[PDB]
Each structure stands twice: as C-alpha cells, then as structure tokens.
Assembly symmetry: C3
Homo-oligomer: 123 residues x 3
C-alpha cells in the first residue's frame, strides 16, 4: 500500500458551537446519533463535536472533496481505550473505492479554542 | 514505498500579511506568479497565501530543511475540484532525489487567524 | 510497511509554561535532561518544550495511548541540521513492538501562542 491522501482541518470551537445553536437541525445533518453521545450516555460537548467535524472535513480533503459526500456517511467511533476511529459508508465509501482506499487513520486534538484533526487514507 | 518525511507548519495570518505589506519584494521571493492568483484571475488573499507559505515550510521540514532550497522551487497548484498539490523543481527536486522521494501529499486549512499545512513525502 | 498510527497534538504555550512554573518537579517528569537543553548548552525555552510535550502526546495517540507509558521513554533528539527525531525505549518501545512499529516520523511547529506536533508510526 501507499498513501492516497492526507487531510488536515482546524475549527474554531466557539464559532462551531454558535452554528449548532443557531440552527437546531444542524447537529443531525453533521453527526450520527452515536457521535452525539459520550461512552457513558451523556451528551457530547462542543469542543469534542468540533473535533469530529474537523475529522470529517479532513477526510473529505483526503478524498479530494468531490460533490455528493454525506456527513453522515463518515462516522467517528471510539475504541474502549478512548482512541478515535473512522468508519465510512455509502457515498464516502464509494469515493474511497474510486481511489483504492483500504485503511483510514485519524487523530484529534482540541486546545486554545481550536479543534484540529488529521486524516490519512492509505491503500 | 514508505514515508520519508513529514512536516507541519502553522502561520499567524495577520503577522504574515503584515510581512508582505512591509516589504513589496517578499511576495515574489516566496511565491510563483501562478500561486498569487485564484483560478478566476483575481489576486489570492492573505489567509490562502499564508497556508501556501506554511505548505512550503512543511515541505522543507519533511526534507530536513537543508541550506539552499528556493521557495520558488516548490509550487502549490490546484486541481479543478479545488484540491491543492505540490510540484517540485530545481533545488527542492534535487534534495527530494537525495532522499528518494517519489510522491508528495499536502493538505491546507485556515481558521481562527491561523493557517496550517501538513506535508508527507513518500518513496 | 504501512501506517500503524497517526497522532496530532496542540498545546497552548502560556498554559504549559504556567504548569511548569507551578510545580518544579513537572519538567523532570515530562522531559529527559537532554531535551531540556539547546544544542549549545543553554536552557530550552517554553514554546520549544511545549512542542516536545505535544510530540509525546501525539506519539501516545499514535499508539492508542494505553496505560503505563512513561514520558521519559519517548525522547525528542535533534540532528545537526536541526531536524527533530523520536527515540523510544522501555514502556513506549514495548507498546510500539506490540503494534509492529519499525519507524517514527515527527514534525513540530509553534506560532500564535500554540505549539503543534504530528507523529506517524509505520511498520
Ligand atoms: C472544501 C472544504 C473541505 C474546506 O474545508 P474548511 O474546513 O471549510 O476550510 P479550510 O480552511 O480548513 O480548508 C480550505 C482549504 O482546503 C483545500 N481544499 C479545497 N477544496 C479541496 C478539495 N477538492 N480537496 C482537498 N482539499 C481541498 C484548499 O487548499 C483550501 O484552501 P485554499 O482554497 O486557500 O487553497 C469544505 O469547505 C467543504 O466540505 N466543501 C463544501 C462546503 C460545504 O458545502 N460544506 C460541507 C457540506 S457539503
Ligand atoms: C526551520 C524552519 C523550517 C522552521 O519553520 P518555521 O515556520 O519558521 O517555525 P516553526 O515553529 O513552524 O518550526 C520550528 C521547528 O521546526 C523544526 N525544524 C528546525 N529545523 C529543521 C530541519 N532541519 N528539518 C526539519 N524540521 C526542522 C524544529 O523542531 C523546530 O522547533 P525546535 O527548534 O523548538 O525543535 C524555517 O524557519 C526555515 O525555512 N528555516 C530557514 C529560515 C529562513 O531563512 N527562512 C526561509 C528562507 S531560506
Ligand atoms: C488522551 C491524551 C493523549 C489526550 O491528549 P491531550 O493533549 O491531553 O488532549 P487533546 O485535546 O489533544 O486530545 C484529546 C483527543 O485525543 C483522542 N484520544 C483519547 N484517547 C486516545 C487513545 N486511547 N488513543 C488515541 N487517541 C486518543 C480523543 O479523540 C480525544 O478527543 P475526544 O475525547 O473528544 O474524542 C492525554 O490526555 C493522555 O496522555 N492521557 C492521559 C492523561 C494523563 O494522565 N497525562 C499523561 C501522563 S500519564
Ligand atoms: Mg476547514
Ligand atoms: Mg476550517
Ligand atoms: Mg513555522
Ligand atoms: Mg510557524
Ligand atoms: Mg492534547
Ligand atoms: Mg492538547
Ligand atoms: Na454501506
Ligand atoms: Na527542473
Ligand atoms: Na530499552
């Protein structure tokens, strides 16, 4: 295998929270039900959601961000140890197949009011 | 192939714009004519230029930033879909050959007053 | 080989400096003697240390951040040309072996009050 694409994205946490609050429908357009909850069942916070949004944008960049990708066709899930993972379906899986992507790698960070993500697509 | 180097760079957009304005000659030392324009023909903005500068610094880091690299020997170009790409020539191509680099991967982001880039060299 | 993990981390420089000053013992828990010095022998500054901390956090993320990793078992060292490198020992080396990691790639940046690092584990 080799690298097919890389993406980076930085989101301003305050700006992202304001966007979610402005339009009630927005959270459900960007996130699956599972992404909106913490492992315990509590509602996921704004910085953590902003990092997940950054991850989806970074994923889109790694694929050359064609038209037709659905936010909900990229899912950030979490291993027991706390590690974030990408699962792709539908439109995002189809674009990944066009490019030959077999494996996804992601990391998230949030500090100083910004949420950051890096995504590497390999295949 | 495998990874030969990775680079990251973050630039403060306001500081970068101030530098360009202070010294008229600076833009032409850092950027090719093509990089200074948008696809339509309009002049590229400061945040976008700062991200391109960050990309060139990240590229230099991926190569171990030896003396003798010219800014103008790294070019950020843009696919129809909007995706940024690196093309290397001259001094930067020669250093890349020393290390066996065959492929370049880049992504750019700008938010909250900062421009960010990640570059991976593979070969 | 292929990619085993990626990590990113962003640290607020001011917050990190305040933490070091608050607890004298903290620097020695996070850093080896060698990391606390510049090539010349002078004491390494706060932004540079914050970037090294970010690197160790990014490394931990690339390995899935299990319990039991020691800060001091990840070392940032510097090539003559100025390039940062990772050397892993003990607990961090053992976790890397569990995952099959043969090679480490790191880059650091600090601007606009934030220190950033990206780490890729390959094997
Ligand atoms: C293009 C997009 C990925 C950019 O991400 P963003 O977080 O909004 O903005 P960022 O500052 O982080 O990134 C912008 C950079 O990404 C890069 N980018 C743009 N198009 C890209 C593509 N086709 N592939 C890879 N990278 C792309 C560019 O380098 C751009 O900077 P530049 O124009 O100065 O060169 C994003 O806006 C998007 O998903 N496009 C559609 C917008 C939209 O309708 N929202 C999503 C729902 S469909
Ligand atoms: C070295 C250079 C790449 C750093 O990038 P920058 O955007 O200016 O500063 P950043 O904060 O983002 O990066 C600094 C970090 O990059 C790393 N860096 C320095 N030298 C490096 C090299 N040889 N290879 C890879 N990374 C290097 C270091 O880890 C450094 O942090 P540290 O000294 O605390 O360990 C950059 O200053 C440069 O191009 N060097 C020459 C300066 C110059 O004259 N300008 C360019 C025209 S020649
Ligand atoms: C988990 C840890 C790596 C996070 O790094 P940080 O710089 O403190 O915080 P960041 O904002 O940069 O990163 C947080 C993100 O990292 C990711 N992360 C958490 N656990 C992870 C793990 N097991 N593997 C990979 N990434 C992980 C998550 O995506 C998290 O965001 P989310 O919970 O919203 O999804 C770090 O706190 C740590 O080393 N854990 C132990 C804390 C500690 O005691 N200090 C270190 C001495 S043992
Ligand atoms: Mg963005
Ligand atoms: Mg953004
Ligand atoms: Mg820099
Ligand atoms: Mg910088
Ligand atoms: Mg962190
Ligand atoms: Mg952090
Ligand atoms: Na499916
Ligand atoms: Na040439
Ligand atoms: Na050892």
């Amino acid at each position: 295998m080799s690298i097919i694409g890389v993406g980076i994205d930085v989101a301003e946490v305050e700006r992202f929270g304001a966007a979610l609050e402005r339009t009630p429908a927005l959270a459900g357009r960007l996130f699956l039900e599972s992404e909106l909850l913490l492992p315990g069942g509590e509602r996921r916070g704004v910085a953590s959601l902003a990092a997940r949004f950054a991850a989806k944008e970074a994923l889109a960049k790694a694929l050359g961000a064609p038209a037709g990708l659905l936010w909900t066709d990229a899912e950030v899930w979490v291993e027991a140890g706390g590690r974030p993972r990408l699962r792709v379906t539908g439109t995002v899986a189809a674009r990944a197949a066009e490019l030959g992507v077999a494996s996804w790698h992601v990391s998230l960070s949030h500090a100083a009011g910004i949420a950051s993500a890096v995504v590497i697509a390999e295949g």
